[PDB]
Amino acid sequence: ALFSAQSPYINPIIPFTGPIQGGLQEGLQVTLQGTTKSFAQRFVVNFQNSGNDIAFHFNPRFEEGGYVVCNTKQNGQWGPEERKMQMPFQKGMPFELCFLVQRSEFKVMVNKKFFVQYQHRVPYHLVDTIAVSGCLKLSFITFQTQN
Amino acid sequence: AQSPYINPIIPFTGPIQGGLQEGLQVTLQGTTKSFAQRFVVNFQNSFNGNDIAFHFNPRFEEGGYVVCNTKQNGQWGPEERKMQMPFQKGMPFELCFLVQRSEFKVMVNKKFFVQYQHRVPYHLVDTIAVSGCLKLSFITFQT
């Protein structure tokens, strides 16, 4: 059972950028509730420091049959991409998107089902910002702890 | 752990004595063919033949990348692609699979390359299959 870590962001204007109080922490659950636009090609969820360094870049693309890119950006440089070759979102449809911060990875769920993992390439502690952009809208983003 | 296969002839299929278990390292020392398009390391279960628990498949195409996947009931699941090629063609390699509780851990030339979380129980694997553009001097097993 989860408790809120910080007041949520409600109906935030895309492109959105906002602090995560105290930074990412083990057991933090970040939930995004929103709708993929009807003719969406891409969107982006970034966990960054304060766009130059992105610890975790989550980038669904409705291209080439539909797939999702996980990656990290350091000093302006993209690392090797990890692509999960399936599209768990649907243009025009609402979705629930959850990021669980674990010790060794982000676990990602889409609509209450496991979708991908992404092992930390830089520590999650240095993240104090979530940025969201691209072809979607959001009802909310929540922050929840088990503690 | 069990005794090595030595210059196994590719395409190859051999038993893994006792099957997979936690802490097992399976090592492949080999050489990528000079004009290598693709190769395949499959972990399979001889009791449902053509299924593959873990398919590891470097592809020298589109910049070089590696496919990890699973085949069940004759059906491929969603591919996990690492968009990076850690094998140079014509060059030797040390390919290393570490069986862990919740994943395969893959080391290439002594560097961590990828993990692949188990989708079917790892205990089902009693077979290693190697095919495509390479030759192999060894497959070892230790604990």
Account of the protein in words:
The structure is a homodimer. Chain A is mainly β. Chain A has a single domain, classed as Sandwich (Jelly Rolls). Helices cover 0% and strands 54% of the residues of chain A. In chain A, the strands form two sheets. In chain A, strands 1, 2, 4, 10, 11, 12 and 14 form a seven-stranded antiparallel beta sheet that branches.
SSE blueprint:
The structure is a homodimer.
Chain A: E1 3-4, E2 9-10, E3 16-19, E4 29-36, E5 43-48, E6 54-61, E7 67-74, E8 77-78, E9 82-84, E10 94-101, E11 105-110, E12 113-119, E13 129-134, E14 136-145
Antiparallel strand pairs in A: 1-14, 2-14, 3-13, 4-10, 4-14, 5-6, 5-13, 6-7, 7-8, 7-9, 10-11, 11-12
Distance between the termini of chain A: 9 Å
> What's the CATH class label of chain A?
Mainly Beta
Q: What is the CATH-assigned architecture of chain A? A: Sandwich
Most extensive interface between two protein chains, with residue counts: A-B, 9 and 9 residues
The secondary-structure class of chain A comes to mainly beta
| Biggest sheet statistics of chain A | 7 strands, antiparallel
Helical content class of chain A: under 10%
Domain unit count of chain A? 1
**What value does the Rg of chain A take, in angstroms?**
14 Å
Beta fraction of the residues of chain A? over 45%
Tally of DSSP helical segments of chain A: 0
Query: What is the N-to-C succession of helices and strands of chain A?
Result: EEEEEEEEEEEEEE
Shape of chain A: globular
Give the oligomeric state of the chains in this entry, treating copies of one chain as homo and distinct chains as hetero. homodimer
Compute the number of strand runs of chain A: 14
What is the CATH topology descriptor of chain A?
Jelly Rolls
Subunit structure (chain A): Homodimer.
Subcellular location (chain A): Cytoplasm; Nucleus; Secreted
Protein name (chain A): Galectin-9
Binding site for a beta-D-galactoside 1 (chain A): 46, 57, 61, 71, 78-84
